[PDB]
Amino acid sequence: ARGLNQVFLIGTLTARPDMRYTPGGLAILDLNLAGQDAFTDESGQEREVPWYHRVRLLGRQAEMWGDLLEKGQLIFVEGRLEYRQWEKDGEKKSEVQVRAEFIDPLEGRGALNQVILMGNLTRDPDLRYTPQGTAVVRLGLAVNERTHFLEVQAWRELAEWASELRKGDGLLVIGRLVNDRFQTRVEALRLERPTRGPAQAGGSRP
Amino acid sequence: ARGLNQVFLIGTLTARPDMRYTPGGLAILDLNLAGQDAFTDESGQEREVPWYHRVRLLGRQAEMWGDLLEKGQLIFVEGRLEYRQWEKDGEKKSEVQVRAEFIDPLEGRGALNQVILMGNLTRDPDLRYTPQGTAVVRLGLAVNERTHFLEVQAWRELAEWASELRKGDGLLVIGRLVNDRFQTRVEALRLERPTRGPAQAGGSRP
């Protein structure tokens, strides 16, 4: 594909979902989900961070659930990232939220956070280093599967590789959604550069 | 969702793709991809297995690439699993293949195998144990996002949990696609049971 925007989550409801409708009649259901990621590796030496994401469900899906979800329920989400900007208003000029296309409450018997995107860089990479000497890069990505602008961050080896990218380059991103004003951004676990599609005729050749 | 069928791969072409058309004019392009998964964990004690999957691209996508792919090219695939059965013919009565909706050749500068499914069990679980005493279960899953029948396998803790499932139960599967007659099946890395949708009125109540 050219523009790809996919989010998969599995977290627990932190409050009872509260229904709501628009003046015209559109059902809107916001679910606050929490879970955690184990950023650790090797034989320990690291640990694991928590995440809290509000996911929005609209329409008939919102209509069939906005009444049955109890605080503490484990839920599976299949959705995408939504970018919105305005004047005035909010916290701030803009926000990125998770939009649920579907949801499926799961049995708890007695967390998953994955994101995959593909777009174009909106500006040149920004490589920086931490006091300890760890490479870190911030990337601006434009995704149109309106256009959505998303922030991505990568560390160490990946950061240094990404520092060689150029504004406008295509980028495939695979990672997890993270928090922090306050901003929802993507923490890249994997990065690849898709070579552009087939090569036209060309005036002077290439 | 109810029926979910998503496959994501990143592997290297093992031969130059060979174009082909149907009598009516449909473009068909088969790509043979290879890669490997590191089934290992903890401080070693394990290693990593290889995979070879033929992915089929049809139509205009097949038309725009079936000429530019060189043996050795790294490719990203976004697709789904396809089940086909017949009489006579093949190897054998049936086959499961990966159907590519899109593909994106990637720059190699100078592997990914993930599957997510949701369907219903077609029969009761089959729990077995290895000589070493390791729990292993084989599950039959029916997915309709025609219906596709897929085989799934899980080990240890997951296998014993899955042995408590019943024919007809809903199941969410997250794992990797594996080989081996010869059969393409799914190796579950994660399993969850989605509680069925909202509860009707009910004659005697439930």
UniProtKB/Swiss-Prot annotation, chains A, B:
Residues 4-107, 112-195 form the SSB domain. It comes from Thermus aquaticus. Pfam families: SSB. Homodimer. CDD domains: SSB_OBF. One of its GO terms (cellular component) is nucleoid. NCBIfam families: ssb (TIGR00621). Keywords: DNA damage, DNA recombination, DNA repair, DNA replication, DNA-binding, Repeat. GO terms for molecular function: single-stranded DNA binding. InterPro entries: NA-bd_OB-fold, Primosome_PriB/ssb, ssDNA-bd. The lineage of its organism: Bacteria, Thermotogati, Deinococcota, Deinococci, Thermales. Plays an important role in DNA replication, recombination and repair. Binds to ssDNA and to an array of partner proteins to recruit them to their sites of action during DNA metabolism. GO terms for biological process: DNA recombination; DNA repair; DNA replication. This is Single-stranded DNA-binding protein.
